[PDB]
Design a protein around this ligand. Structure first.
Ligand SMILES: *[C@@H]1O[C@H](CO)[C@@H](O[C@@H]2O[C@H](CO)[C@@H](O[C@@H]3O[C@H](CO)[C@@H](O)[C@H](O)[C@@H]3O)[C@H](O)[C@H]2NC(C)=O)[C@H](O)[C@H]1NC(C)=O
Lengths: 48, 49
């Protein structure tokens, strides 16, 4: 019983995390380009 | 039995404070995005509510 309870808890917390993944997903966006921001050194934000 | 009832009272207090906070949240929705067209996209209505 506690095993199916923790299985339920794990599945609903995964449910919550992809609800917030659906929340964070934009309808449209732009690919990140190196040298972004012009003179703005945002290279730590660069995902490469 | 008395330990079981003590744990029962503990979880009843847990669900009581959870219901109190949930009622605070519920009145926050009914005052925030129900009676008004707020800009809370996804907080209560997904997309542009
Ligand atoms: C934007 O910021 C980042 C990080 O703050 C800068 O990264 C820099 O990257 C270079 C390349 O690895 C590092 O150069 C190294 O310097 C040492 C001596 O300092 C040298 O011996 C190595 O051979 C290597 O060339 C540099 O340390 C690093 N800077 C920092 C602060 O970590 C990047 O250059 C910045 N871009 C602009 C346009 O300002």
């Amino acid at each position: 019983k506690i095993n199916q309870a923790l299985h339920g808890a794990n599945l609903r917390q995964d449910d919550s995390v992809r609800n917030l993944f659906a929340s964070v997903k934009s309808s449209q966006s732009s690919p990140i380009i190196p040298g972004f921001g012009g003179d703005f050194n945002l290279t730590l934000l660069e995902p490469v | 039995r008395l330990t079981t009832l003590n744990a029962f009272v503990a979880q009843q207090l847990v669900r009581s404070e959870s219901a109190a906070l949930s009622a605070q949240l519920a009145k926050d929705k009914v005052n925030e995005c129900v009676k008004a067209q707020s800009k809370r996209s996804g907080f209560c209505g997904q997309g542009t509510h």
